[PDB]
Every structure is written in C-alpha cells, then in structure tokens.
Subunit: 292 residues, 4 copies
C-alpha cells in the first residue's frame, strides 16, 4: 500500500481546449497554431479556386497567397478583387468574419498559455518532515511552508486534509476517508502572510485526529496528511495552488523545526531540517487528563 498524494503534488490515482493547450510544450503548442491557420488558409484558398473577382492568380499556390493576404488583411494589390461575380464578394465577408473568430480563439489560447500561473507555484516549498512536539502546554503537529522567491506570493491560505481508511459502526468501508485538520481556520490564522517561511501549527486537541495517538502508536498508524496551500501572486491577482503530503513515517515525534531566520537574512538550507528536544511521548489526550 503506497501513498495517495506525492511530496511534489501528483496523485497516485487513475481514472476546454485551453486547458489542453496549457499542458502542452511550446514544441507542440506553436504547432497547433500553425496548423489551425494553414488549414483555414487551405480551406479558404480552395474556395477561391472553386470560385474560378480574382486578379493575377495562376495556379494553386496563387490562390493561397491571396487567401492569406485576405484573412491576415495584408492585401498587396497584386491580387485584388473585381465585381464580375457575386460569389467572391460575399466569400470575403464570411472569411473576414471567420478569420476574426479563428484569430480571437488562437490569441485567447496564446494568452491563456502564457498567463498560466503554474510557474509561480514552483517556488512554493513545503518542509520535508512534519513534527509533533510540545508548544505552550499543548502537543502540536507542525510543518513548515514558504516561498523560495521573496518578491511575489506573500498572501496565501493553508488547509490540511487527513486521509485514512475508515469503517463505520454499520460496517461501510471508506477507502480514502478525508477529514479536515485545523491549521487555523476558526481564527483566521490559516490566512497566511509569507514574509518568510512560516511554521504551520495544528493544535492536537479533542477534535484532532491525532488526539489519542502517542509516540508508540504513531508509526503503527496508516495515515496521510494532505497539505493544500494556495496563494495569490504579488504582481498579478492570479492565484495558484501547491500541494505536498506527509505519510505516517514522515512525521517525527519529539522534534522541532530548525529556525531559518537570522537586516533579515533567510537561510534556505535549514528549511527542511529538524531537531528533537525533550518532548512527552504521550497522546495529547492522556497529557490533558493528567494536566487536570
């Protein structure tokens, strides 16, 4: 049994032309466009030849240069239009109208491909390990988060899902039952502001799915913490998502994050790195019972 979300953000789960085109390399992309235009010019060029209104046209090649010069609106005036036919005068209209729509679509896509905010999502980095340790009387599940590029994407919001197999009192099996892990939702502390990389901290309370799990129970647990971080880029109001996961073994008990902060200079080497201090090995449940 392997994981459901990989550290980078791909799902290990199998099943708008714009959204097709964005996922395509420039190799393949440039190519869509050239074709889409040629096939219109081929199509319309063939209709001029079916119309033979035309000036200086001698072969197949001559009708092409016109079709293009008409649709692109160049019109050198070596190949002009006359009045002797009804059919050619009206084709030019249907062409120039359609030559507008096909253009708009292509530029719409061309923009959507370049506008895509998928690039900004790359510098968004998650810590490699999640750590459970004590923090102000309470046992806290913690992980780091931030951006590798300082300028853009400071505003964001974190959420976390917990995926585990489940069986109900009634016996129904829920394979990937997810429940939301509170990373600051009720307070508005999940609305992040990534000046620097921040430690996101889930407080292990009575509502926490980690309530009754101790240091010993932990590795003997088949759970996965999915982490979704979505933020708005600084130069553009366009927002992008970023995911990483944490399987059971990826969570270190008794550990605490290595502070990356030292003018303010941010040390990106220490980012993923963690250290352990003396931390109770007990479930947050039993710690709270003995606290009372």
């Amino acid at each position: 049994i392997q994981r459901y979300v990989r550290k980078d953000g791909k799902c290990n789960v199998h099943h708008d032309i714009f959204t097709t085109l964005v996922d395509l390399k420039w190799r393949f992309n440039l190519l869509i466009f050239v074709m889409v235009y040629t096939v219109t010019w081929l199509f319309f060029g063939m209709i001029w030849w079916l119309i033979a209104c035309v000036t200086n046209l001698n072969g197949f090649v001559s009708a092409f240069l016109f079709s293009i010069e008409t649709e692109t609106t160049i019109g050198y005036g070596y190949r002009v239009i006359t009045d002797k036919c009804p059919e050619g005068i009206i084709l030019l209209l249907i062409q120039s109208v359609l030559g507008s729509i096909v253009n708009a679509f292509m530029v719409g896509c061309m923009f959507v491909k370049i506008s895509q905010p998928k690039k900004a999502a790359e510098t968004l980095v998650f810590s490699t390990h999640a750590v459970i340790s004590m923090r102000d009387g309470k046992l806290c599940l913690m992980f780091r988060v931030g951006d590798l590029r300082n300028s853009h994407i400071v505003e964001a919001s974190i959420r976390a899902k917990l995926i585990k197999s489940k069986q109900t009192s009634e016996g129904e099996f829920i394979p990937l039952n997810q429940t939301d892990i509170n990373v600051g939702y009720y307070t508005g502390d999940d609305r992040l502001f990534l000046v620097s990389p921040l430690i996101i901290s889930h407080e292990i309370n009575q509502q926490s799915p980690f309530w009754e799990i101790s240091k010993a129970q932990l590795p003997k647990e088949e759970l996965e913490i999915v982490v979704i971080l979505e933020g708005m880029v600084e130069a553009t109001g366009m927002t992008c998502q970023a995911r990483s996961s944490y399987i059971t073994s990826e969570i270190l008990w008794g550990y605490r994050f290595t502070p990356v902060l030292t003018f303010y200079e941010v040390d990106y080497n220490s980012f993923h790195e963690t250290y352990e201090t003396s931390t109770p090995s007990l479930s947050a449940k039993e710690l709270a019972e003995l606290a009372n």
Copy 2:
C-alpha cells in the same frame, strides 16, 4: 409542478449574445458586420477622395477593405475632399468597437464557469442511510478531469414548502443543508469521487422524515460546486438537483476505489451505482428518541 434545476445543472444586449448558441452567435455577427459595411459603403457613395469606384458594389469592397484594414490599393484615398478623410477615421474607430464586442463575446462565451466544470459530475441519485450511528443523506461528486479545482467547495439547499405555527405558509422555503460548512469539510479536495454527507441532525430539514413519508414528500435538493480552474484565472461551477424520487432510502454508494499496481483505479461505471442495506424505517428524530431512552 416541475423541478428548477435539471440533472445537467441548467435551470428551468451583451448577455443576450453570450447566452445564444454558437450557430446563431456567428450568424448574428455576420449580419452585424454586413450592416456596418452596408451603412459605411452607403456613406462613401454619399461622398460621391475615392479611386476606381464604379457602382454600388465598388463602394462595398472599399468599405470592407477599409474597416477590415485590408486596402488593396486598387481603391485608394485622395485629398480633394474634406469629408472622406474624416469618415475613414469615424469608420476605423467604430470598426474597433464592433470588433471588441465580438472578441468580448468570444472570451466570455468560452470562459463561462458551466463550460469549465463540465468534467465534474454528480451522482444520479441521493441516498439516505446510517453512518456511525447518525442518519445521513449522501450524494457523490467526482472529477473525471486530472486538472484539479482550486478552492473546490460544496453546498446544498432544500426547496420544500412549509408552514409556521402562526399560520404563515412559505410556498418555496429554502433552508441550507449542511454538507460540512461548520468544520471546513465542505471545502473539497476532489480527486477521487467523494461521497458528501449531510448528517441528519436536529438542524436538518430531514430530521422528522421517515421511510413511508419520503415518497409522499415534495421537495428539491439543489447541489452546487464552485472552485477555480487550476490553469485559467476563471471560475468553474457544477450544479445538479435531486428531486424526492432520486433520493433513495436505505441505500449506499458502491465503492469506486481499487488498488492496482502502485496506483489506484477509479471505476466510473460504479460512480452512480447504489446498493441497499439494512437501515431503520424511522426518522432521524425518532431514532434519537429510541436511543435516548
């Protein structure tokens, strides 16, 4: 009377054009252009500045070649008149306005949020059965697309008539169904088709409704899903509705998740399918009293 939202989610001067079908959208535009070319072509003829123009037809080819900015140079402009030099300006400016309406209509017609979430599907039925002691109304949602949805989120309303103690009748009362609102669990991480659960508690409009009352009842659950397309800046939306007959009592969804060679296989044939299980005939209210004693 009928429903208000169909299974496919559809309900029962610029907006007018984007609401139209493509087939017509283009047809209107063709007219819209001809009528500008007719109008402006007629003004060139009223101006007769012109070169090689002989009849009505000749002024047209110019009007078009001017507005489309082709200009073959068989029909050029001279200087002898004031009127023609300035018309060309008013034409070329107005030729941008018309163009903008078209591209405007494009961008909008395509990037509408119904057309983005077309890959999001809702299960054909809702089901009412027991989950961990609580009676639950459930339906299934799923993305066929691998292109995930940013800030995906579920919500549902119940459209049923009701009457107050004071004798006030509300013909089409709407009360929101909780589908994870208070916990955050209504913000979906939607990869595998999820089974959304409304826990029929005290606050549920389904609190008092039993197995034998279910068919006799007259109501409509509307299910709405809004996120953002990961790749575009534009929103996606998926609606669906469950009328009283599509809400199966005492049934469960067939699991769509299987482990197949370092990957998990989702069977979308099983997506809609449901199976019957032993489930109480009482309302969630009446079960609460039984368990209370």
Copy 3:
C-alpha cells in the same frame, strides 16, 4: 436628519480610467476613442512632415492619410516607404509598436465598458417595506428579494447592515455606527438561490439589535437597515451588487408578506405588498421571558 442609503442604492454622503469610462454615456464614450486616435494620428502625421522615405505626399492632409494607413496597417501603396532616410524607417517601428499599445488600451476599455455587469443589477428588486411579525414561536424582521428576469442571476448572497448613531460608555460619538444583522450567515442560509422572489428573514434574538424594541418603541427609533445583495449572473460568471434601505418608518409591525407564488406563475404585482395578522406588540426580549 435624512437617510444614508436611498431605496435604489445611492449614498447621501459627500466627499483606473476604465472605471471613469464605464460611467460615461456612449455619446461621451465614442468621443474619447475618436479623439485618442486622432491625437495619435495628428502627432505621428506631424512627425512624417518633420521627416520631410515618403511617396506621393503633397500637403498636411497627405501625411495624415499615411500616418493612419500606417498605424491602422492599411497601406494602400499609393504612399509607400523608401530607403533614402534613416529616420523614417525607425519612426514606423515606434509608431507600429505604440499603435499597438494605444489600440490595446482602447479595446481593453471598449470591452470593459460593454462587459460591465451594471445592467444585470437593475432587474434585482427589493421589497418596499420590511415587516416584523411572528414566525415559528419567534419574532422575525422580514423583507423580500428576487430578480425580475427569470433566466439569469439565481445564485446570490444576502447581507444586512444596521446603521445607527452610537455613544460609548466613555462618551465617544459614532455617527453612522453599523452592526451586521444576521440574515442567515452562520447557517449558510444567506447564500440565496433565487428561483423565485424569497423572503429574507432575520430572527430577532438576544444578538439582534431589535431584541428590546417593541411595536411602541419602533417608530420612536432612529435606525436604518442597509441591505446588500450580490449575485452571479447566469450567462456570465460576472457578479454584481444591489442595494436598498429600510428606515424606521419603512418597517411595518404586525405585518406579513403577500405570497407571490401560484406550472409555476410568479405574480410580480404583489411583490412589495404586505398584510397584517394578529402579531404580539412586545419586544422579542419580553416575549422570550414570558415564554420561559
């Protein structure tokens, strides 16, 4: 002392070029554009005349037709470009680049003006009177809401502000102190779905600013209920706002809305109309005290 928000949605309170242009009539709008283009053609036409590379140009008028034919990219070829000068060849570049930006800006605006969702906000209608009456044991402040056009804008969300003069224990005067009136926020019942016109219902509870006010107290009260309704149009994901107000005298005690529903045919005449039934004249506070 008059109101702060008028029934239509204007504020009785005194104090991006796109947002300037949207508010302008087509009379004035068409006009901005024509000017913006002429002034570029005048400017660039004058630079061709400063350059005198040119073919068949005789007066001021001749340089204009070129400047236009170059910027609009027409180029009839009665006025072509030669090679004898460095200056003209490079101007054409600066023109065609700037002739792109000035165009883009104009079409950007032209779209933003037509795309404006201000029109859809018109058919959005509010009831003329707000009514306080009993509804399932509880005293409820109620008002109607809906769209005059059936097709578009069914999804919306209601919120309500309450504006009243205020003075703190410490003596600070807050002239237009607003507090949010719960019209279904905590439940998600404020997320409307306007199949038909709906009665929005504020439950007068211990949190309600109308808690301690009875039928007698009501007219002797200097309060205003601001009502913001914002919804997304059906054909376009573009969303628009719509406001109406309710001053103290606009709220009828003992009254209940006339049901507009009777296939389903919606009776838009009865929309604003209301009727009174036997309703307790007591503050929701004292009614709850005697209920216990």
Copy 4:
C-alpha cells in the same frame, strides 16, 4: 530591522514584465519587435518570391510590413520559390504569439488589484483606547472613490516574536487579529471612512500589553482589504502596516462626518487625525482583573 509592508502597502518571464515600470515595459517591447523583424528580415535575405528588394534595408521594410500586416504592394510576394510562401506563414503565426504577449502584458499590468484600490486609504496611525468597557485597538479605512467595492473585507495580522513554555522561540510569529471575523462585521460596507475595531480580549495578542510596555515592544500589524471593483470583473486590494510607533496609546480618531444640507460631508483632512483621551495605563488583561474583583 525594518518593516515588511510600507504605509503605501508595497512590500520590503511574464510576471517579470508586468512587475516592471511602464517606461521599461515599452522599451523591452520595442526591442522584442525589432529582434523579430531583424530575425525574419534576415530570413528573407537568406531566401534571396520577393519584389523590389535591393539591400538589407529593403528586406526589413518587408519583414515589418508582413508581420504588422501592412503590405504596401511595392514589395509583394511571387510564386517561383517554395521557401518564401511558407516562411510568411511561420512569420504571421509567430507574429500573433508576440502580439498576445504584449496585450497579455497590457491587460495584466493595468488590471492588477493594487492599481484598483489606489483610492482606498488607511489612516496613518493605529490607536489604543477604551470602547464600551473593552480596550480596543482601532485604525481607520476609507474610500475616496464613489465607485464602491463588492465584498469589501478587512483582516489584520500581528508579526511579533514569541517564546513557548517549552523553550521554543518563534522568530516571526503571526497571529491573526480579530477585526470582526466571527460576527461578519469584518465584511465592510465601505462608504464613509470606517473605524475598524479590534476588541483586545483574552484571545488578542495585545491582552497583556500596557502603556509603558507599548513603546518597548517590537511588532508589526499588517492591514489588508480585499473587495471587487463594482465596474470591472477584477479584484482590488489595499495593504498598509502599523509598526509599534504608529500605534498611539490612549488616543481616538477625530470624527469625519457632518450634516450639510440634505447630505453628509466627509472631511478627509480629519481622516488621519487623532485626539488623546483619558484612558487606563494598564493592559486589557489587568483591567479585566480589576473589574473582576
């Protein structure tokens, strides 16, 4: 060390271009076009299909007239070569890509959300004083524009260092300041400049901080306001920051609202202004203990 957000809200291949100043934005583009015209012009010369072309300069005017789609017809295309007929296609297609980047950069550069809320202003100072028994941190926000903001909403974070009982130091702890989140009162109806209030209760990071501690403290309040421009589909945003010295203790905002002939007059000179009032020297915590006994 310095702040992270300035008073004006600004902090301390495509995104690279939209982040640039206009002056440069255009300059880059001029190059971007010349280098395409140079490149393609050189391919026409490598092709030498051409009419009236004599030197290097002649191939340029064509390359441009072809890419810009001008085409004067002094330099036309013939049929004798295969190579030239097909280059023109690759050129005219690639001439759209470059154009799209430019318009792309336009649309984006202008409709960025900082540039929309430029009319939203924040008060220069924050103030800490008493309101209806509760100690309150307040700041003022205001729209100079009459064009209102759809779904306007306030939020604030406090950037202060702290240390846990277990000896864990958090260099730049962020804890959200409540400015109406739980009630809905953080959704602003923003016409008149509002005085946003954080009630310094048990949950406030300012709970324990007194008058004499205030200056000695090292923290940063960040204030963020997001709504939508009523007229455009695009978002607007206003940031500002209040460093420890901009938070006046025991002060109050001067009222900006006056009744003047069937209308109300807002004085924006008074917007930023504050006045001192008798206010306790204790923390909101210590006042709570005094009142408790």
